[PDB]
Amino acid sequence: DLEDNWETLNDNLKVIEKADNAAQVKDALTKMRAAALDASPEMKDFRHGFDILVGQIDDALKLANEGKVKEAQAAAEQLKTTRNAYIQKYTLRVPDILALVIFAVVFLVGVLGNALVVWVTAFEAKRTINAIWFLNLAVADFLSCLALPILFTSIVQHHHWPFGGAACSILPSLILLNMYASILLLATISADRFLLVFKPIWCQNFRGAGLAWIACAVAWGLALLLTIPSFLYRVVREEYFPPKVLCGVDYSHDKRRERAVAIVRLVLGFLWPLLTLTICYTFILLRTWSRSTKTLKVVVAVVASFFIFWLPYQVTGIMMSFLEPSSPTFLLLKKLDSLCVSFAYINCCINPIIYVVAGQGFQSLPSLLRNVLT
Amino acid sequence: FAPXWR
Numbered sequence A: 001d002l003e004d005n006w007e008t009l010n011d012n013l014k015v016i017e018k019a020d021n022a023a024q025v026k027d028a029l030t031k032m033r034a035a036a037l038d039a040s041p042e043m044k045d046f047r048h049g050f051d052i053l054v055g056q057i058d059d060a061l062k063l064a065n066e067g068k069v070k071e072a073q074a075a076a077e078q079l080k081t082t083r084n085a086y087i088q089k090y091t092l093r094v095p096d097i098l099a100l101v102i103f104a105v106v107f108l109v110g111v112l113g114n115a116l117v118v119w120v121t122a123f124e125a126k127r128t129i130n131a132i133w134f135l136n137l138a139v140a141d142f143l144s145c146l147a148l149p150i151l152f153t154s155i156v157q158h159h160h161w162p163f164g165g166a167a168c169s170i171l172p173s174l175i176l177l178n179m180y181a182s183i184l185l186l187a188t189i190s191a192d193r194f195l196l197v198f199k200p201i202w203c204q205n206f207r208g209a210g211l212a213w214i215a216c217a218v219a220w221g222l223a224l225l226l227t228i229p230s231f232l233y234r235v236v237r238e239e240y241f242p243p244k245v246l247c248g249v250d251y252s253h254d255k256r257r258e259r260a261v262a263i264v265r266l267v268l269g270f271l272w273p274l275l276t277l278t279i280c281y282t283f284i285l286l287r288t289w290s291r292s293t294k295t296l297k298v299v300v301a302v303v304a305s306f307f308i309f310w311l312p313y314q315v316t317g318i319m320m321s322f323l324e325p326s327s328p329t330f331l332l333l334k335k336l337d338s339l340c341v342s343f344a345y346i347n348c349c350i351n352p353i354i355y356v357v358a359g360q361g362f363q364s365l366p367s368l369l370r371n372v373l374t
Numbered sequence B: 001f002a003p004x005w006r
Ligand SMILES: CCCCn1c(-c2ccccc2)nc(-c2ccccc2)c1CN(Cc1ccc2c(c1)OCO2)Cc1ccc2c(c1)OCO2
Pocket: A183, A184, A187, A188, A189, A191, A214, A215, A216, A218, A219, A222, A267, A268, A269, A272, A273, A274, A276, A277
């Protein structure tokens, strides 16, 4: 418990920063004292630093024991500074590492895969509707995938963000854009499937490239409009101990707005689509099983993959929104945020994988994709 | 404030 004592220290430090009464301050300072005490000419110096730390903790503890909450918290701020000098004098979380691995593989597979898919569907885009659909999906996923290397770099550098406020606003939002764009596109495609099965005459009367392209345009516009509100609430914050730059969201003094965003994102981005699409393909699959399945199964697989890979993000998000920022579970989930987002990001590379698998179940790669997406 | 996405 080398890193763990320090983790308890910073966690309880944030607890003191967000303390309700003197009692919580005292308890947190007690845990900090225990963790600081729990932790050669170099060993004498690190132990010296730990001693100064424990001393300041005891001072703050005296203050808390008196009844001066604010003053004890001030002493704790100073504690943060000295702790910073002592730690800077002398590791990354497992979930962040998993997030790095996932980000990497999703980047490779997403970039190469969706570049190949775009290449393939581009030939037949204005000749076949399915090509339009798959093209739009691939473009969404790829565009989202372009943001990954910078996120990777930032995570490797312990959340440090040297790319500016604008980039901080736009690049991390691209995955959300990918979510909405994906779900709207998929919804339109699902409508198309339904009509192909139950109202074919409409399809003989309506279907042209134009309607598909318009539907795509509206899907994209709506996705952008659904993405901008969160985009505007992205802000950078400079940390002074140790010096670095953080990129994040800012719902400060507006917890209700945070909850609102979490809820709206859950409903419009997951639950409503789950309901409607499940109804849709219940219809379609029951009819089919009572009687083009090659493409249909692919579409179904993609739809399922959406919810499969978005589920943890949504769960952790909502739960986090209903938790106090000073609660241990909240801090845990906060630490798990990047991993959940990576798991969500798997959606931006899973499509070419599905296409390749179905194609293999049909037995060159672009030729195979041509045959699958047509 | 919260770094990242949430
Ligand atoms: C074929 C996709 C339709 C999207 N949608 C879903 C939809 C369903 C599943 C997955 C994604 C979206 N439920 C409702 C709908 C709702 C109430 C009354 C009538 C229709 C809608 C109708 N939406 C307007 C619209 C019209 C035409 C469009 C469009 C959007 O893009 C493509 O061409 C409004 C809407 C509404 C809720 C949404 C949403 C969009 O996205 C997230 O959640």
